[PDB]
Amino acid sequence: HMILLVSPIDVEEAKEAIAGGADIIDVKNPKEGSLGANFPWMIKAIREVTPKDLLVSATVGDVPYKPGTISLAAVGAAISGADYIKVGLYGVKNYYQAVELMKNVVRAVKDIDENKIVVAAGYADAYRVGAVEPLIVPKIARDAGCDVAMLDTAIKDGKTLFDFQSKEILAEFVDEAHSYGLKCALAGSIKKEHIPILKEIGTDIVGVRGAACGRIDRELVKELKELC
Amino acid sequence: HMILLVSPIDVEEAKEAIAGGADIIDVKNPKEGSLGANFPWMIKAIREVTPKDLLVSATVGDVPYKPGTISLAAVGAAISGADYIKVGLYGVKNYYQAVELMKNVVRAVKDIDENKIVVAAGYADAYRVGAVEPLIVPKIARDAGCDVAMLDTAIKDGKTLFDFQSKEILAEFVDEAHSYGLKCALAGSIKKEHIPILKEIGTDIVGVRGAACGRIDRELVKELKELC
Amino acid sequence: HMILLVSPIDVEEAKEAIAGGADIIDVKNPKEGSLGANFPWMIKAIREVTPKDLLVSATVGDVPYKPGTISLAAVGAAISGADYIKVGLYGVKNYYQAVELMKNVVRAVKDIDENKIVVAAGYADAYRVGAVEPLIVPKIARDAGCDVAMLDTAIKDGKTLFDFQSKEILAEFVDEAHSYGLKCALAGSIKKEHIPILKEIGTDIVGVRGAACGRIDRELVKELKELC
Amino acid sequence: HMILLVSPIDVEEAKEAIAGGADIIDVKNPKEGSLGANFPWMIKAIREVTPKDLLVSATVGDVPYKPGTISLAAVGAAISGADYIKVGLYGVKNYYQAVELMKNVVRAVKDIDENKIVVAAGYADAYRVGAVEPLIVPKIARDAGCDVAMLDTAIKDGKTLFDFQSKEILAEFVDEAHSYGLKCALAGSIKKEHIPILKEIGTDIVGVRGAACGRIDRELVKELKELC
Amino acid sequence: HMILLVSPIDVEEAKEAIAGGADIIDVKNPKEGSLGANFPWMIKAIREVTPKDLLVSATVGDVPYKPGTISLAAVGAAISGADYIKVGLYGVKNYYQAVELMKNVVRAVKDIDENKIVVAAGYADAYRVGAVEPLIVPKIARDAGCDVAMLDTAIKDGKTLFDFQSKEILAEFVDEAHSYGLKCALAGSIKKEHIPILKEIGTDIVGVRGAACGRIDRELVKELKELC
Amino acid sequence: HMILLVSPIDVEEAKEAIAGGADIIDVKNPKEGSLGANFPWMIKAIREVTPKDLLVSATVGDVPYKPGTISLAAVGAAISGADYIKVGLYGVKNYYQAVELMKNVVRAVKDIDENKIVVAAGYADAYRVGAVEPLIVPKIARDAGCDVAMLDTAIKDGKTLFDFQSKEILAEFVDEAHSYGLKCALAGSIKKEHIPILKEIGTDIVGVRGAACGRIDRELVKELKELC
Numbered sequence A, B, C, D, E, F: 001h002m003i004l005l006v007s008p009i010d011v012e013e014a015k016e017a018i019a020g021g022a023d024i025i026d027v028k029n030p031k032e033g034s035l036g037a038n039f040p041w042m043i044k045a046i047r048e049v050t051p052k053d054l055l056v057s058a059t060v061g062d063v064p065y066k067p068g069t070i071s072l073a074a075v076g077a078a079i080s081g082a083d084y085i086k087v088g089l090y091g092v093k094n095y096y097q098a099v100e101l102m103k104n105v106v107r108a109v110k111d112i113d114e115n116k117i118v119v120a121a122g123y124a125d126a127y128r129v130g131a132v133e134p135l136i137v138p139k140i141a142r143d144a145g146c147d148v149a150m151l152d153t154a155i156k157d158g159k160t161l162f163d164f165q166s167k168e169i170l171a172e173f174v175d176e177a178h179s180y181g182l183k184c185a186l187a188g189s190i191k192k193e194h195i196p197i198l199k200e201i202g203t204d205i206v207g208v209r210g211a212a213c214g215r216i217d218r219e220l221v222k223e224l225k226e227l228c
Helices: A011-019 A040-049 A067-079 A095-112 A134-144 A167-179 A192-200 A218-227 B011-019 B040-049 B067-079 B095-112 B134-144 B167-179 B192-200 B218-227 C011-019 C040-049 C067-079 C095-112 C134-144 C167-179 C192-200 C218-227 D011-019 D040-049 D067-079 D095-112 D134-144 D167-179 D192-200 D218-227 E011-019 E040-049 E067-079 E095-110 E134-144 E167-179 E192-200 E218-227 F011-019 F040-049 F067-079 F095-110 F134-144 F167-179 F192-200 F218-227
Strands: A003-006 A024-027 A055-063 A084-089 A117-123 A148-152 A183-186 A205-208 B003-006 B024-027 B055-063 B084-089 B117-123 B148-152 B183-186 B205-208 C003-006 C024-027 C055-063 C084-089 C117-123 C148-152 C183-186 C205-208 D003-006 D024-027 D055-063 D084-089 D117-123 D148-152 D183-186 D205-208 E003-006 E024-027 E055-063 E084-089 E117-123 E148-152 E183-186 E205-208 F003-006 F024-027 F055-063 F084-089 F117-123 F148-152 F183-186 F205-208
Touching: A003 A218, A011 A024, A011 A040, A011 A218, A024 A040, A024 A084, A040 A055, A040 A067, A040 B067, A040 B095, A055 A067, A055 A117, A055 B067, A067 A084, A067 A095, A067 B040, A067 B055, A067 B067, A084 A095, A084 A148, A095 A117, A095 A134, A095 B040, A117 A134, A134 A148, A134 A167, A134 F134, A148 A167, A148 A205, A167 A183, A192 A218, B003 B218, B011 B024, B011 B040, B011 B218, B024 B040, B024 B084, B040 B055, B040 B067, B055 B067, B055 B117, B067 B084, B067 B095, B084 B095, B084 B148, B095 B117, B095 B134, B117 B134, B134 B148, B134 B167, B134 C134, B148 B167, B148 B205, B167 B183, B192 B218, C003 C218, C011 C024, C011 C040, C011 C218, C024 C040, C024 C084, C040 C055, C040 C067, C040 D067, C040 D095, C055 C067, C055 C117, C055 D067, C067 C084, C067 C095, C067 D040, C067 D055, C067 D067, C084 C095, C084 C148, C095 C117, C095 C134, C095 D040, C117 C134, C134 C148, C134 C167, C148 C167, C148 C205, C167 C183, C192 C218, D003 D218, D011 D024, D011 D040, D011 D218, D024 D040, D024 D084, D040 D055, D040 D067, D055 D067, D055 D117, D067 D084, D067 D095, D084 D095, D084 D148, D095 D117, D095 D134, D117 D134, D134 D148, D134 D167, D134 E134, D148 D167, D148 D205, D167 D183, D192 D218, E003 E218, E011 E024, E011 E040, E011 E218, E024 E040, E024 E084, E040 E055, E040 E067, E040 F067, E040 F095, E055 E067, E055 E117, E055 F067, E067 E084, E067 E095, E067 F040, E067 F055, E067 F067, E084 E095, E084 E148, E095 E117, E095 E134, E095 F040, E117 E134, E134 E148, E134 E167, E148 E167, E148 E205, E167 E183, E192 E205, E192 E218, F003 F218, F011 F024, F011 F040, F011 F218, F024 F040, F024 F084, F040 F055, F040 F067, F055 F067, F055 F117, F067 F084, F067 F095, F084 F095, F084 F148, F095 F117, F095 F134, F117 F134, F134 F148, F134 F167, F148 F167, F148 F205, F167 F183, F192 F205, F192 F218
Parallel strands: A003 A024, A003 A205, A024 A055, A055 A084, A084 A117, A117 A148, A148 A183, A183 A205, B003 B024, B003 B205, B024 B055, B055 B084, B084 B117, B117 B148, B148 B183, B183 B205, C003 C024, C003 C205, C024 C055, C055 C084, C084 C117, C117 C148, C148 C183, C183 C205, D003 D024, D003 D205, D024 D055, D055 D084, D084 D117, D117 D148, D148 D183, D183 D205, E003 E024, E003 E205, E024 E055, E055 E084, E084 E117, E117 E148, E148 E183, E183 E205, F003 F024, F003 F205, F024 F055, F055 F084, F084 F117, F117 F148, F148 F183, F183 F205
Antiparallel strands: none
16 A cells, blocks of 8 residues: 655635545645755644644755754744654755764654654755765665655656656665655656555655646546555 | 854853853864854753853854755844854855855844854955855845854864954954944954054953863953953 | 936847936846946946936945955956946955955046945845845945945845845835945845835835836836836 | 076065176066066166166066956056066966966057067966966067067976976977077076076076075175076 | 778778778777777777778777877887877877877887877867977878877767867968878868868868767768768 | 785885785885876786685775776786786765775786686775775675675775774674675774784785885784784
8 A cells, every 4th residue: 555645735725625535635846856845834834734643744954964954944844833844954964964863853843742753855966966875865764763754856846756766666665665664755757657656666755746737626536546 | 242152062161261251152173174064952951051041152164055945044043042153254255155055044044043153254365265255245144134243264274253354344344344333353363452542442342262261261261352 | 306327138138228217227237146347348338328317226246255356346347337346245255354445446446536436235145145244234334435235135146135124124224324424226026015114114226127017018017117 | 698687576686686696687476476567667776776677577477268357467567667578487387378468568568669578478377376387488489479478387386497307398399489489487496406497498588586585695696697 | 181080980881981981980989088999809890891992990099198109109000900090189288298108109000010000189179188289280290200180079968079179270281280291180070061061171181970970870870971 | 813914115115015924915005195107017016926725815906987998908907917906996975886886897907817806995084085985896896796895995094994993893894795795804004903803804915014124024914824
C-alpha cells in the first residue's frame, strides 16, 4: 500500500485534496524553491482545516548548510502544526554535512514532540543544483535518525523523477531505506502513469500536485488514491 | 545610557556575562557565520540560567533570502526563550528583499508575543560579502516594523565597525533609526576604546565578546558596563 | 516644473529632440551599457548643433571603481562640451567607494568650471548588476559635493524605474536629495504615463528616449514636454 | 640607444628622476592597478615641474573594454599635459576588441594634438589576469595606428618581465614592432641587470621605478641612464 | 592547391565524403566540444573504410591544460589509426602552457610513428571560451614542433571563421605558418562562398561539414573539391 | 591479506618500492592533480624496471566529463604498459555521468587486453573539489563493469582518508564493493597507523607514498608490507 501526499497551494486546495482522499497534506512554498518553506501562519491554517485522522507535512526549505538556522526552522514548523518536518538537502554537499544538519533537526523536532516525523529529502536531479548525491539519502537518514528518506526534483522544468533516475536505481534506493527501517517517499513531477511503477518498487509515500490538477480536483485526487 | 549586550559561547560564559553586569545575553553560533544561529536547546539553556530581569537575544543566522525559512527560524528562537530575535541581512541584496523577509519575521515573532523584539541587522562591511547596503538598514527596519536597527561585521578578521564606518556616518545611522522610533544596536569587534564614541552618538545597545576576554571574564564585563 | 532630458542616438536625433522642446540633450552610448560613454567627437558635434540656451549632458560610463580613470574621463567629457557630466555608479559597491570616486570626478569637473554640473547616478535595479544601493545615492551625492542625484535602470530588458522602485520610496529619494540642496533626475524606460507621477513627487529632471519614439520624433518630444 | 622612463610616486620623486637624467617622467597610480590612472591635477603638476626638453607619460588605467570611457580618459590625460598616453589592455580579450578600443583612443588624442603619442600596453603575465595575449600587442598597435607597443607586468608580486617572457620571444616582439614602424617599450619589475639584455634586443624605451630606488635616488637614475 | 577535409558524423557519411573527393576524413565528436574526441573504435572504423591513399584525422578534444592526459590521448588516437592527431587548445591560456602541452603530444605521437602529423588547433572565437589567443597558434606550432597550425570555431552557433577573423589577419596567419615550414588548416562553419577566399590566401587545408549538406552528399563534396 | 600499492616519483623510487616488497607500482603525476596522468614514456620505463610478477598501475587523470578523451587516454596508458588503468572521477558530477565515462574506458581497455584492470577512483574529500560523491563509487564501478572501486584524497594538504571518512562508512564501502564482486583500494595520505584499520575492514589494496618516506626507503616499504 502506497500513502498519497498532496501539496496544495492554498487552504481551498487543501479542502479539495482532503475531500479526494489525500493521506498527507503537504505545506510548501514553490516561490522559495522545490521544497521552499511556507509561513508559520499557513502551516497552522492547514493543520486547522485538516481532519484529525490525516497528517500535515511542512518543508523547512531547499536548505543551505546552516544546522542552527534549520534546527530553529524545524521547531517553527513543528510548533505550527506540522506532523512531518521535511528538509531539502540543497546546500549540503556530502554525507557528513547532511548527517550533521539532519541530526540537529531530528533533536530539535523530537524535543518538541517525539511523535513528529523527520524527512530527509534529496534531489533526483541534484547535479543541476550542486546538491548532495541523492543515492546516499538513505544512509544520511539512517545515520541522522530520520524516519523517512525522500527524493524530489530541484528544478521544476517538467522533467520528472524518472528522467533523472532509472527504475532499477530507485528500486535499490527504496530497498536500502527499508533495510535501515525507514519509510521512502518519492516525488518529482509525478504523473498518474508513474503510480503503478512507484507502487511496484515498494515506495511508501508518493508526492503529487500536478497529477491532481489548473487547480486540485477532488475527482482526480480520488483517482490517484485508487491507483495507490 | 547604553545597554551592554554580550555574546557568550556556552552556559558557563553566560553566567560570567550575567555576573559581570551584562544587560542582554546574546545567543549566536560563530561557526555558522557572523550572526550564525545556535540551537533551540542552547537558547533554552541560556534563558534558564539568565535571571528573569535580563533579556535573552538569539540570532537566526546570516540569512539567505528565504522569508518562509527565516520566519520559521524566528518562531523556533522565540519559542526557545529568545526575547530579542536578530536577523543577519546577508543574502538579501536590496531594500525590497530585506523588507519582505523582515516583514514576515516581524509577523512570526509579534504573533507569538508583541513584546518580543525584532532586530534587523546589517553588516558594516556588507560589500565584502555582497550583503544589503548597511546605511539603508534604518529604513528597512522602519518599513518592516522592526524594533531595532543594528550593524555588525560579517568577516571576523579583526577589522572593527570603525574600520568600515566613520563616526559621522554612524551618528547619522543612530539619528535616523531614532527618528523612525527605533532603537540602535552597534557591534563589530568592539573594543573598550570604542565605548565612549558609541555612547556619545546615542547608541542604545553595544554588542561585545572579544572586549570582555580566551574566555568571558566577569571583571572585564564589569569594566565595559561601567564605561556604558 | 520638470525639465525634459532626451538621449539621442545621433546628431539627427539630437536636432529632433531640440525641435520638439527637449531642455537637456544627453549624450550616451547604449552599446557600452545603461550609461555607456560616447566619444569626445560625438559630444562636441552634439554641443555644436545644440542651441546655446540648452544644456548638453554626457555620461562617462557604467563605471568601475577606478577614480583616476573616471576623473580623466570627466575631464574629457567637460572639455568636449558637456555641461552635465553623469557617472553611472556601477562597479562601486558601497557608500565609501562611491563617495571617493565622485569626490575626484567633482574636483576634475569643478576645476574646469564651477558652473559645470556633476550627476551621481545609481541604478534602480542595482541588485541585478551588483551596483551600489540606489537608496543611498542622495547621501553619496551630498557627501561627494555632486549637484544632482539620479536613478536609471542598468538592464534594458523593458522593465521600468517603477518596476524596481515604489512611488513612496522615489518620493523619499526626491525629498532627501532636495533636503541636501541637490536636484533629482529620474529615468529607466520612462513612459508617458509615468510623467505626472514623477512631476507629483517633485522630480527636477526626467530622462527619456523610448517614450519619444525606432526614431526620436519631435511631435512625441513635444507631447512629453507638454506633460512636464 | 635606449630611452629611460621613470614612474615617480610624487612631484618630489619626479624632481629626483629629472635630476638623475630620466628621459620620460611617467605618471601612474599603482593603487588602481599596474597601469592605474592618476588624477588630472597630478599629471598637470608633473608636466609643470618637468623641463620642456623632457616628455611626460600618463596612463589611463588597466582598462575595461569601454571605448567611449577610455577615449574620454585619454582626452583628460592629454589636456592635463601628457605627451605619451598609455592604455593598459586589461579588460580587452582579443585582437579585435583591443584594436577597436585603441583606434578610438588614437582618434581622441590626435584630435587634441597630432604630436601626442599613444602607447598600447599589454601585460607579459596577461594569463594571471585574463588580459589580451601580450604577443599580439605589436599587431594591435600597428592596426590601431598607435606609436608604441609596450609590455609591463599586471601583478606586482616581484615577478619580472623575464619570468614571463623568454629573451627570444621578447626579441621577436621588438623586431615585429620595429617592422611595423613602431617603437617598443618594456617594463615589469626591471632591475639594473636586465638593462643590457633589453638594450641588446633593440628595446627603444625601458620603464623603471624600483631599479632607481625606498625612494627614487638621482645617483641610481644616473647609473641606469649610463647603462642605457 | 587546397586540400579538402570533411568531418563525417558516421561511417556512411565518411563513404559519401570519400566518394565526393575529400582528401582528409576527420573524426571528431561534437557532443564533447568543437574538437571533441570520438572513441578509439570509431577512429579505427573510419581508418578502415577510408582508402589507404587518403589520410584520417582525429581530434583529442577541446583540451584542458593536462599534458599527461593529452599525451596519452594522442597515443590512443594514433594507435587507433589517426594519421593527423589534432589538439584543440581550449584550456591552455597562453603561449607557454600551449607549447608545453603540444611538445609532450609531439613526443608521444613521434614515439608511435614518425610519419604521423600533429595539428595545433586554436579557436578563431577563443575570447568566447577563454582559450589561447588564435593569432599565436603559428608560433605555438613552430615552437612545439607541430606540423600544422589550425583555426576552427569553438561555439557552433552559426557564426563563421570570417565573422571572427578578417581576411587580412587570416592571410597573415597563413603566411606566418608557411614562414615556419608549417601547413595551415582553416575551418569554422565554412560555406562554399568562403572557399575561393581561403584558396587565395594560400590555405593548405579547408575543413567542412555543413557546406557538404541534412547529411553529407557526395555531389556537394564534389562541388567543394572543384572549388579547391 | 592486503596488497601494498606504492606511487614512486621516479624510476629510482620504483626500485626502492620493489626492493621493499611493494605489490603494485603506481604511475601518477601530482603536478596535474591527485590522480594526474604521467607521460607514456614514464609508464613504459616503470613497466620495464618492474619485475614481470608485479603489476603496474597508471592514472589517466583527475578527469573532466569527456568520455572520448578519457577512453583514448586509457588506450595510451594500456599501450604504454599499465596493467591497472585508474580514472580519477573529478569532473563527473553524478552516478550517470560517471557510469557513461567509465563504460567507455572499460570498452577501450578491454579492446587492448581483456586481462587489464580498470579502476574507478573517487575522492574521499570530493566536496572540496565538486567531484562525484565518493560513497556511490562501488555502484559506478559495478554498473560500468570496472574491476576496482577506489578512494583517494583530491587535495594534498595533509588531511587523510580518515579525516574525511569514518571507519564505519569505509567498512560499508569495502563490503558493498565486495558484494558486487569488486576489489577495493584505499589511499589518501595513509600513515603506518592506518594500515591495521584498513586491513581490519577488508581493504584489498592500500596506496601509499609519504608513509614510505623525503624519498621512498625500501626499509620503510618492508615495514608497511609486514603490516599488510
